[PDB]
Write a protein that binds this ligand. Structure first.
Ligand SMILES: Cc1cn([C@H]2C[C@H](O)[C@@H](COP(=O)(O)CP(=O)(O)OP(=O)(O)O)O2)c(=O)[nH]c1=O
Ligand SMILES: [Mn+2]
Ligand SMILES: [Mn+2]
Ligand code: NA
Length: 323
DNA sequence: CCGACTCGCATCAGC
DNA sequence: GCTGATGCGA
DNA sequence: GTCGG
């Protein structure tokens, strides 16, 4: 109990979570373990028994028993076995390549493809996404310091303005909450030519411009509203980074900014209280619920705070939206 | 006991 | 060819 | 996996 508290426990749960998702293809068990780890990581005491943990929300009989075994013996038989298993271990590892999920990792391992070498020997069996994830395997597992994030913002906002002075672009995600470190760059984008009732050609032009100045280096996926790609600060070379660009209608922009800024936990808390007050919020709109529960028409939103107001909540600055 | 627990894009199965 | 299903990362 | 209905 030094790393935060219950670090040994949260790592245990996270590992179990990873095998459920990657080997068992059980997203819900995966989410249960991660939630349980997140509750425990916040619990301000060193846990001394499964019974104590069982009283936490999201901790049931099974994770309680795992904790008693971990506390009594210093390990978990099930995790040690999983850890040493060639097939489970290799399946779990390969999903760390972006574009290889549980299904592709299982097929690869079935035909003897188990390592990065194996993948590099068999590039022909990889789709485009998977090829790039392989290419930048190490880069993609590095975190992005805020200062590189700011340099990256400088480039995104400048180049967007150069395409069209009318574009609005906002870096959201952990960056906007003031995180000192980020896993990727999330960019929201809008324009007056694009409303909920309106050829978008607005995302392609920005993507194209960022490729011309050699900021974006590869494309993982690109449609009329969402781009997923790779980018790189100009120089010893900087790591290649993940960037997502989303084009959203102007009249749903602040709903998107809120959704793609806030931590997942924060978004959940706000969705709950919004129901409490008879509102349903998604990433694009806020709607009132009628007396039966049916949804009305979207309400006007001219500011992130307008959303807080609708549901009678004190404005929470992005820096304070970790939960 | 037992079912519950979002979306845009790429690719593939199949028609 | 196209449509729908499945996979994927968010 | 946990937790309701
Ligand atoms: C995946 C996911 C995302 N969101 C919103 C909120 C999130 O903040 C924003 C950016 O998403 P992400 O880039 O994937 C992680 P992030 O917050 O930016 O932190 P880092 O990337 O730096 O690790 O989208 C959800 O509401 N529910 C979700 O399930
Ligand atoms: Mn992010
Ligand atoms: Mn992202
Ligand atoms: Na993956």
């Amino acid at each position: 109990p030094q790393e935060t508290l219950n670090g040994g426990i949260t790592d245990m749960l996270t590992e179990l979570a990873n095998f459920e998702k990657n080997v068992s293809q059980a997203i819900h068990k995966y989410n249960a373990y991660r939630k349980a780890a997140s509750v425990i990581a916040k619990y301000p005491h060193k846990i001394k028994s499964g019974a104590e943990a069982k009283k936490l929300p999201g901790v049931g009989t099974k994770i309680a028993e795992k904790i008693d075994e971990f506390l009594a013996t210093g390990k978990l038989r099930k995790l040690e076995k999983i850890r040493q298993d060639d097939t489970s271990s290799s399946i779990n590892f390969l999903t760390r390549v972006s574009g290889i999920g549980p299904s592709a990792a299982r097929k690869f391992v079935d035909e003897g493809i188990k390592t990065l070498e194996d993948l590099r020997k068999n590039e022909d069996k990889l789709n485009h996404h998977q090829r790039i994830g392989l290419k930048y395997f190490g880069d993609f597992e590095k975190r992005i310091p805020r200062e590189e994030m700011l340099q990256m913002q400088d480039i995104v906002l400048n180049e967007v303005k150069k395409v069209d002075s009318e574009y609005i672009a906002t870096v959201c995600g952990s960056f906007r909450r003031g995180a000192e470190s980020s896993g990727d760059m999330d960019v929201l984008l809008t324009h007056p030519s694009f409303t909920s009732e309106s050829q978008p050609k607005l995302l392609h032009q920005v993507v194209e411009q960022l490729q011309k100045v050699h900021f974006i280096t590869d494309t993982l996926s690109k449609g009329e509203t969402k781009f997923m790609g790779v980018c790189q600060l100009p120089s010893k070379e900087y790591p290649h980074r993940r960037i997502d660009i989303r084009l959203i209608p102007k009249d749903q922009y602040y709903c998107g900014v809120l959704y793609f800024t806030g931590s997942d936990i924060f978004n959940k808390n706000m969705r709950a209280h919004a129901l409490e007050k008879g509102f349903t919020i998604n990433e694009y709109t806020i709607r009132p619920l009628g007396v039966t529960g049916v949804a009305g028409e979207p309400l006007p939103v001219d500011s992130e705070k307008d959303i807080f107001d609708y549901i009678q909540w004190k404005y929470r600055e992005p820096k304070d939206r970790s939960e």
